Structure formats: C-alpha cells, structure tokens
Design a binder for these strands. Structure first.
Lengths: 62, 74, 189, 102, 132, 74, 137, 60, 52
RNA sequence: GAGACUCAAAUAUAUUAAAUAGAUAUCUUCAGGAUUAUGGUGCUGAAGCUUAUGUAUAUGUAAGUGGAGCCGUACCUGUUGGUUUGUCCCAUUAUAAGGACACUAGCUUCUUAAAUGGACAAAUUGCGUCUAGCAAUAAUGAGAUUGAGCAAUAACAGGUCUGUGAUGCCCUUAGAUGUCCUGGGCUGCACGCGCGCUACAAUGAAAGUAUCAACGUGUAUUUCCUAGACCGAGAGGUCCGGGUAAACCGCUGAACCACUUUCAUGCUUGGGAUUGUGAACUGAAACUGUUCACGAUGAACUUGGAAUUCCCAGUAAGUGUGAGUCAUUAACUCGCAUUGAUUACGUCCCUGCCCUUUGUACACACC
C-alpha cells in the first residue's frame, strides 16, 4: 500500500459526474506493472503519484 | 492618482522598475541595463507583465457583468 | 535578499513526501514575500502548482459571502498567526506548514459514478492537483465554526489543527472528515 | 487694442470634423492667424435605455442606444478686422461656429 | 506635513492646544453624535478638532476648504438606515466655529509657518523621540 | 451549550494566582484567560499590560482585535 | 475596585454584574444607549466604571434626572416624552409610567374612534405597512 | 486548427499567387504589404487573414 | 376658470408627453419627451445609432 | 445565414494638438533644520514669561521676568504666481513678433485623437487521409487589446385595439363610456405564493484614524447642480455666490477594508420589526403612511424542510456611486467603480438540444 506510481500515457473518461482520468501508469519498484489506473483530477504527463490500492483498475475496454 | 487602497500601490512597482531601465539605456551603461533585468525576470512578480485585465461592461438580468439572477419559476 | 518572508527564515523547507516532490514548490523558485498576488493565477488547466502555496493558503479564506472579498485580511490573519506556529514548536513555521499538508492529505480514493449508471463505486486515485488543494479546503472550515458561536477567535483556531496537522494528529479536527471519508471508501474499495 | 478671439467648433460627424482641418485652418495660417493647432475636446456620449417593447412581456430585456458628438476648438490671437471672411468660407453641414461679439 | 502618517500625530496635536488653554469647549458635547446615523455619543472631545492636521494637507492640496465641502466627504464609513445603507453629510454644526478655538481668504492664517512648524518641530522631536 | 457566566473583575484574588501560572506558560493569549475561570476579556488584556514589568512576557502582537503575548522564555 | 455586592438593583429593575455601566443603564426599559453618555455624565458617572462599581451614592442622582429631567438641562427632543399630550410635560418615564401611558393616549382614542382607533382591536401596523401581503406575524 | 480559413481567404487566394508568384516570396511582413498593390482589401484584419495563410503554404 | 382644478406645477401631472399626449408612458428627464413607445418609430432622424 | 464589417481600455505622442492635466525648469514667495556654514552674538540676562493703559482686547514700552540662546543667509523640504513666439522689448491698459539671447530664461510625457500603428499568425514544434503535426514556448503595449450589437427560413391563433388622431367590425353620443370638478379606491387581509433586500454577530458591532474611484451629473422661459459664510440636537432655515458647464459644483478628495480602542458571546451593546411622541419639510392639500430627525420601544430570527438559482476572470461575490421613473418617495431598474476566491479547463448520465440510418397506426405531429 506504500508504492508510488508514475504516469506514461493518458486516455479519456466516463466523465460527466465524476471525471476520473483512466490513465496508463507504472510503478518504480514494480515498474513492470503498467496497470492502467483511474485518477480523479487533472494530471500532467510526467507526474509520479502515490497509491495504496495496487491490485486492479476496473477495466472497461477502450 | 486613481487605483484605490490596494491597486494604487501596485503601479508604484512598474514605475520604480522602469526608472532604472531608461536611465541605463541612454545615460549610464548597457550592462547596467543588463544586470537589472536578469535579476528581475526569474519570476518577476508581474513587474513588467502589464496585463490589461479591466472592468467589463454590465448586462441585463444580473447584478454583475457576467452574472444573471434567475428562477422565473422553472 | 532571500531571508525574511514575514519575519523568519524562508529556505530549508522540505516537502518530505513522495510523491509530492517537484509539484509542491513553496520557496525553491518562489521567494515571494507577501501572499497577495495582483491579477490572475489561472488561464489553463494546470496552474495551481505554479502558484505559491502560501498564496493559495490565503485565498481560500474568503467565503460565506460576508467574508468574501478581502484578501488583505487573509494577509492580515495568517501573518498574525505564524508566531503561534513559531512559538509552538519553535522551529520555523514554513516547515510546519508543508508537513501540515501531509497528514491532512487524502492520498486515497473517492466515490465514482458507475460505468453504466449512477454513483456507487470508487475512483481509484485522486490527483495531487485535486488532493492537496482540497487539503486547504478542509482547514478553512473548522476554525470558523470554532469561532462562530464560540467567542474564541480564529487566530488560535487556525493554530489549533495546524500544530496537529504537522505531526500525527489527535482526535477529530478540521484535519478530519477525510480520515472518516476513507473508512467508508475502504469499504467501498 | 488686439483681440484674442477664441472660437469653439463642434459637429457630430468626425469626417466633417476631419474636413474642417483640411480647408479652414490652412486658409488662415497662410496669413498668421495663430490657430495654435486643433484643440480636440472629449466628446459628449449619452446612453438611453428603456423597454424596447410596447407591452414588453417576454425575456424582458432592454435596448441600448448611443450618441457621439465631438468638438475641436480654434482660438486665434488676431483682431476682428481679419476674421469675418473665415465665417463666410468654408461652411459645412452640421458644424457649429460660435464667435462672441458683445 | 510630509512626515510619518498621523495615526499617532493627530492624537498628539489634539492635546497640545488642549494644553495651551485653547480648548474652547462645545455646549452639547455630551449630547452630539456627529451625524444622524450614529447610535452612541463619543467618549471625549479631543478627536473632534484633529482635522487641523487634515487641513495641513487639505488647504495644502484640496482647497482653502469650507465647512460644507469638508464634512460631507469627511467621515464616511457609514451604515445608514437599516434597509439599506446610503451615504450622508455627517452634520457638522458647531465645528464650523472651531476657528475661534484657534484664536480668496484663508481659513487658518497662522498655520502657515507659525503654528504648523511647531507641530513639525514636534514630529522632528518625535523623530528624536523615536530615534532610540 | 456552555454558558461560563463568570465575573468580569479586576481579579484581585487570582492576579497573584495567574502571576505564578504564566511561568512557564508561554501560551498567554487573550482568549485562553477567557477560557480560564473568572472571565475577564478586556481588562485581562490590560492585566497583561499590568504584566509589563519587563518580566514573564514577550509581547509579540500589539494590534486591533488581538494583543497576542508570549512569556519571557528563559 | 469593588468586592462587596456586584449585583445592582434600582426601582423596578435589577442589574447584573457583567454589563458595562452605560449598557447596564440601558438594561432598564424606558432608556436607551444614547443616554449612556448623556444621563450618566449628567449624573457625573464615569463610563469606564464596572457594574460592581458605581456605588449607591451615585445612582440616586440618576433618579433625580429620572424624576426631573427638566432641571438637568435635557431638551424636549432629547426626552423620552415631550408635549405629553395631556399636561404637556416633557418627560422620561423609565419603566414606571410609559408602561401605563402607552394605552393612555389610546384609551382616549377608543372613544375618539379615529383612523388609528379601531385598528388596535385586531392587530395592524399603524404606519404605511401593507398588511395584505403577510397577513400574519 | 481552431481557426479555419474561410472561403473568402481561400478562394480568392488561388489566383493571386497564380497571377503573381513572380516577385513574391515567403516573407510575410512584406507580403503583408504587397496586398495593397495587386489587390484592395477593405480592412487590414482581412489582410491579417489572407496574407498569413498564403505565407503558410510557400514551402508546401 | 370655473370647474378647472389641478395647479399642475408639481410632479408628472400635468407636464406630460410632448410626442403622443399619452401621460402614462413618458421618458422626460434629459430633454427627450418622446413617450418611448413613440421612440422606436421616431428614433430617426434624431441621431442615436446603436453601438453595443 | 455564421464569417466578414460596428463599438469598447491595452498600443510609437513617433508626428500638429491644449481655459484638461501639467510634467518640469527656475523665478519665486509660504520656510522648518542647525540637515547645513554660522556673521552679529551667547550667562553681561538671550529666548521665554506678566502688569499698566493709550490706540479698536491685541500691540507698544518699561517693570515684571528668567538663565541659554538670539538674529541673518544659503543647502535640504514646502505655498504661490506667471512662465502661450522664453527674456527685455514695444503697439497695447498689459500677451506675440518687430530687438537680441537661452539662441529655447517650461515642454507636451499626461488626459484628450482626429489618425495611422496595433499576436501584423513562415510563431518552434518524431505533419496527422500531404491538407489545421494543441502544445504553452518567439515576442516581452501583445501570448485574443476583446465584450456586445447586428442575425435567417417557414412560421405560432405568443404579446398588445389601454402607446397612438395605426385601425376594421361592434358600443355610444346633450341622460357619456366621452369630458371636466368634488370624493374615494387601486395600498383594503384569517391565505397561498415569486422576485429581492435586513440580519442571524467575532473575518464583528462599535469610536476615531488612515485616506481611494469612475460612468456620469446639472437653471430659461423653468427654479437644477450646488459652493461660501450663518443659525439649528438634528431635520432644516437664512444670506451672498458659482455653474448652461474637461472650466463651477469638484481634482466630485465613494463605500467596504485598513488603525488603536471600546465590547466577553450572554437572541447579546448582534439583529431594529413593532409603537408612542414631538421636531421637520415637500407639495393648495396626508390619514395601512411624503420622507426625514431626536430621544424612547427591542419582537421574530444562531445558517433555514423537500427543493431549487446562477456562474469559469478582473468573473462570481462583497461593497458602493450615478442614472431612470421625481414636487417630495428606491429596498427595484441601467451602467459605473472598488475589493477580489474555491473550483472546471470536461462529460453526454440526467432535463437538453442540432440535420445520419431507422421502424411507425405517426395526422392539429405522444398533450
């Protein structure tokens, strides 16, 4: 629950009422896991980000 | 003159900054003009970014310019 | 020419938070001495990291209609409270402020509109551009109700949670209601 | 002995207000009338607003209306024996000359 | 006078003519509320004639200043009649006779170099007082 | 709802009691003496003006609506 | 200062030990906050005193202004009643007679039966307040 | 992208180079000045329209 | 003479409507006196182009 | 059609332009300080201090009186008056040149534009279906100076005949609905509701203090804007003025803030409904009221059920002024100006909406 995840690639949102950036991020010690997470709020490309839930991302195909 | 109890004190900054830049252009020295600019322009605190943001004309149905009071029984 | 923000040392302030580094910039490029800026700090999506935090720490105070408008009173009330942050834990107050955002940081989920319908599920991360500015949002509430019908003033109630937000916090303050928020979010997530 | 006749000139149309500096002031500075240049005044703007609609029922906004009339002053350090001919020529539609006599 | 702002200096001068016997006390001074807006009478009288320091700048910069041009624009922070507040004239009255307290035309003829320089010597002495 | 209907007073019975309380109590605020018993709000601030014997104080705020004090920290 | 009583009491009204001497005077019905400097300095009462202060040798001369405001240089416009109507005497009747006199002009008017007379039967705002709109409260 | 060249700034542009590609270069601020000679614009913002696009295609 | 009251010199009545003789709908206090439902038809030729 | 054009402060005074403003320069006068240099002067009675009365109480003087300064200059920092083709000339009562000098012994920064200028975009960017590669980044008044106004096609039983001497038809006409007088009433109130302001106080209520705008605004045949003195708790009243207006009001020296305090949170000095009373005053005339004064009177209400409004920057919002209806009556209305956020920089759920395929019994179009 202590790992930090840095972003590489960005995709859109199921936005309207809770815009949450479905976004491609990877860790550092777990940098081989490029799990496509979902961050709420604006995020610039190149930002390392903290994380506690490091299991899944509630995938819908896009 | 003008300004107020806040914004009138602002325009001192543009005055006191450019007072050196023109006395150094035509009277003192080129590098004296250069040594007073590079210390400023690191972040400059809009000492020379004179944004022309001004008061906007008002409209109807509101108490403000880009406002409108409403609920005529939706 | 780098000394004396209000009355104190300015540098040697560390954001001791991965991943909050290189996004929270208070001093290292912002040696701006008073927390009042003139014109506008928003033209695009990404502007809040480019603002000084102590500027943003003041502008959230103007709310509730009858207090909306006077940033100079926000400039008045915060510079009259840093000494309380300077007398309690006599180290420099600005290092106490950057450590205050950490324990008051909801570095966790939020509630999400579901992927076919209404809102039940979890937004699996919240942006630091959204998080630590909402960490300012929680603090400007609690002192006001601590001063509204109470007849203590905000200047001690600003220093109430801020000395607790720097360290590991005590029982429920303005730092709380987000620690409560992730308990129902962990049952959500 | 010598008179200082200070004469105001006004009009609505700026082009006629631009026309008068083309023909009047150079027909006098050729013989040293001491015009001291075009003394432009701030205009007199007026805005009237009301209900634009007889029985104004619906989306009940207003109509704005503007007006601009500009002035430009010609003073002269010359006596009365020189300045009667410029009052005769040239004359323009909608310009107003005002010379004091008594 | 062009020294430090007269937050404390207007407190100083109001006692100095009060020291030299030129008080010239008003008659309803426990009754007056200096305008038809106020709800409490003031604490004392010394704050009334502090505007000799104003006319060290108002005869200096505004005009040889009459009573009506003074008090209307003077003293406005006013919450008027409850629904809702407006701006008023502050209702001078007896302070138009404050020239007797000092003893094209001019209001105070002795405050040119005779009276005001002494007050300027006071702030020059206050420059020496605030020197430590 | 708290009431705290204590007496506004010169506090002769407790002025020596607070005199031994403020060492080493560096948290001498005008609100906490009102949070103390025998609630004085105005003259208790003036009681810290009566604490101006060049001892047990370090006055840091002399302002409208707040006069914040710290003690003479040894 | 004072340690003995700290609870003042005058005719028809008791005084706490918290209100300042101008506003503790305002705590009595029949007088307001404008008299807080007027009748106190007419009674030579220091406004910086406390409710435990302003002892009994000072409060009696206040009642001399209450029982006779004419001798203490108070004008009629500066009085709680002026040109009574009946007996014409200018007055301040602090908590003792205005409670009675409020109906005394009206109890004529129940027999006069004017514009303002019959309205006090049911409840109506006697100035130009339009009573249709609320109709209540 | 967000600003689109309209028909007047495009369909009038197809002949002015076709008539006078000679003695015309890619330098905008002088090709800005040349619009008065071969053509007559009503207003210089339309000169700010029609001259920028034709200088945005000379390499193309 | 007789049966003609109203000493008109106060208020609107009766200094009304130099354009339509309709007392209720006047705009007066610049010098227009145009009875502004008789203004849109009568805006020209008396200046008054709209500019914003 | 939209674009395009129309307006609005940023934009070289670089060109002519001032009864706007003046920058200035220096003439000055309004001069502190000793910041300066001191000459006369300095314990010898200076400075300062009182009494007497003349003059019409001040001043004069002596005595009184007291023990270090006095007085003058220039530097410093300040009123004022002109510095228009400057000075001295002259005509002139005095401006100009004519006579010479600085040869500019005040020029146009500024406000005003009347103009061209003005992100005027090859703007650099692994060129996207070669076509319009976001990229902020290049500028450095300028990363739109930038908002409204103008708005089609077919229309709807939308709105109005009470805007009109636009008006059909119908109604009336000496006994009128017309028309002018006297009146009332539209304001009437157990009730429903909407639009807003007043608060629900500690980022305050008080006192002062510091000391900041702008659109505008204003009397000729009707009494506006006002200043100045004067009186009055006030409200207001009197007298002499200015101003038909960059000119006087006025440089309008606006509120909220800011600065020492007074208050001790107590429906409280928060909050001012109610209601007496006189004091006003406008108008021939006031009474659910003309408004305004003074001193009384201090309710309801401590954040407001389900609901539901608007909005992304000088904006929202606070906080004001002017204008409009006006003899007096703004709590609305039209813009002005100050103070100056959170957050969004999207999405197509939901109520929306715009024409591409699409079934239909859809029709006066799911009412």
């Amino acid at each position: 629950p202590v790992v930090w995840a840095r972003v590489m690639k960005v995709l859109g949102r199921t936005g309207s009422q809770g815009q949450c950036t479905q976004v491609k991020v990877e860790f550092l010690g777990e940098q081989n896991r490029q799990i496509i997470r979902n961050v709420k709020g604006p995020v610039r490309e190149g930002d390392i980000l903290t994380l506690l839930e490091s299991e899944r991302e509630a995938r819908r195909l896009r | 003159s003008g300004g107020g109890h806040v914004a009138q004190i602002y325009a001192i900054r543009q005055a006191i900054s450019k007072a050196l830049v023109a006395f150094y252009q035509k009277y003192v020295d080129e590098a004296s003009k250069k040594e007073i600019k590079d210390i400023l322009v690191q972040y400059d605190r809009t000492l020379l970014v004179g944004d022309p943001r001004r008061c906007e004309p008002k409209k109807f149905g509101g108490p403000g310019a880009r406002a409108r009071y409403q609920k005529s029984y939706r | 020419e780098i000394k004396l923000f209000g009355r104190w040392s300015c540098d040697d302030v560390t954001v001791n938070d991965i991943s909050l580094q290189d996004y929270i910039s208070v001093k290292e490029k912002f040696a701006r001495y008073l927390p009042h800026s003139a014109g506008r700090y928003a033209a695009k999506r990404f502007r809040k990291a480019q603002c000084p935090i102590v500027e943003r720490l003041t502008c959230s105070l103007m709310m509730k209609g009858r207090n909306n408008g006077k940033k100079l009173m926000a400039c008045r009330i915060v510079k009259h409270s840093f000494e309380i942050i300077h007398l309690l834990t006599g180290e420099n107050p600005l290092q106490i402020l950057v450590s205050a955002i950490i324990n008051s940081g909801p570095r966790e989920d939020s509630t999400r509109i579901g992927r076919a319908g209404t809102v039940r599920r979890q937004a699996v991360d919240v942006s630091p551009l959204r998080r630590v500015n909402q960490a300012i949002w929680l603090l400007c509430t609690g002192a006001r109700e601590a001063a509204f019908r109470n007849i203590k003033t905000i200047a001690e109630c600003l220093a109430d949670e801020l000395i607790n937000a720097a360290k590991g916090s005590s029982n429920s303050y303005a730092i709380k209601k987000k620690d409560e928020l992730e308990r129902v979010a962990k049952s959500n997530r | 002995s010598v008179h200082r006749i200070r004469i105001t000139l006004t009009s609505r149309n700026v082009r006629s207000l631009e026309n008068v500096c083309r023909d009047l002031i150079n027909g006098a500075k050729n013989q040293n009338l001491r015009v001291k240049g075009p003394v432009r005044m701030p205009t007199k703007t007026l805005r009237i607003t009301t209900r634009k609609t007889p029985c104004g029922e619906g989306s009940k906004t207003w109509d704005r209306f503007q007006m601009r009339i500009h002035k430009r002053i010609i003073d002269l350090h010359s006596p009365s024996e020189i300045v009667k001919k410029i009052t005769s020529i040239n004359i323009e539609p909608g310009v107003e000359v005002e010379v004091t006599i008594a | 006078v062009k020294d430090i702002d007269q937050h404390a200096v207007t407190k100083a001068v109001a006692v100095f003519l009060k020291k030299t016997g030129k008080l010239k006390v008003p008659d309803q001074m426990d009754i007056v509320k200096t305008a038809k807006f106020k709800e409490l009478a003031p604490y004392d009288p010394d704050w009334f004639y502090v505007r000799c320091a104003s006319i060290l700048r108002h005869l200096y910069h505004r005009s040889p200043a009459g009573v009506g041009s003074i008090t209307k624009i003077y003293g406005g922070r006013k919450r008027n009649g409850v629904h809702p507040s407006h701006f008023c004239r502050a209702a001078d009255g007896a302070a138009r006779k404050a020239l007797q307290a000092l003893e094209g035309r001019k209001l105070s003829s002795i405050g040119q170099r005779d009276l005001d320089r002494i007050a300027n010597q006071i702030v020059f002495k206050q420059r020496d007082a605030a020197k430590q | 709802r708290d009431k705290l209907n204590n007496q506004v007073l010169f506090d002769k019975a407790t002025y020596e009691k607070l005199y031994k309380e403020v060492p080493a109590y560096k948290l001498i605020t005008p609100s906490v003496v009102s949070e103390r018993l025998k609630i004085r709000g105005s003259l208790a601030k003036r009681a810290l003006i009566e604490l101006r014997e060049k001892g047990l104080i370090k006055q840091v705020v002399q302002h409208h609506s707040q006069v914040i004090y710290t003690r003479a920290t040894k | 200062p004072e340690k003995f009583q700290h609870i003042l009491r005058i005719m028809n009204t008791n005084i706490d030990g918290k209100r300042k001497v101008g506003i503790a005077m305002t705590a009595i019905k029949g007088v307001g906050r404008r008299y807080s400097n007027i009748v106190l300095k007419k009674a030579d009462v220091d406004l910086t005193k406390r409710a435990g202060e302003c002892t009994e040798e000072e409060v009696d001369k206040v009642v001399t202004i209450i029982s006779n405001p004419l001798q203490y240089k108070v004008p009629n416009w500066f009085l709680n009643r002026q040109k009574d109507i009946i007996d014409g005497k200018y007055w301040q009747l602090t908590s003792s007679n205005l409670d009675s006199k409020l109906r005394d002009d009206l109890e004529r008017l129940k027999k006069i039966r004017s514009h303002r007379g019959l309205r006090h039967y049911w409840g109506l705002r006697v100035r130009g307040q339009h009573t249709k709109t609320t109709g209540r409260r | 992208m967000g600003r689109v060249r309209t028909k007047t700034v495009k369909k009038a542009a197809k002949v002015i180079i076709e008539k006078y590609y000679t003695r015309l270069t890619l330098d905008f601020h002088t090709n800005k000045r040349i619009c008065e000679e071969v053509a007559i614009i009503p207003t210089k913002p339309l000169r700010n329209k029609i001259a920028g696009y034709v200088t945005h295609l000379m390499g193309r | 003479t007789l049966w003609y009251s109203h000493p008109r010199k106060y208020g609107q009545g009766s200094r009304c409507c130099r354009a339509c003789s309709n007392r209720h709908g006047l705009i007066r206090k610049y010098g227009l006196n145009i009875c502004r439902q008789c203004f849109r038809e009568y805006a020209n030729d008396i200046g008054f182009k709209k500019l914003d």
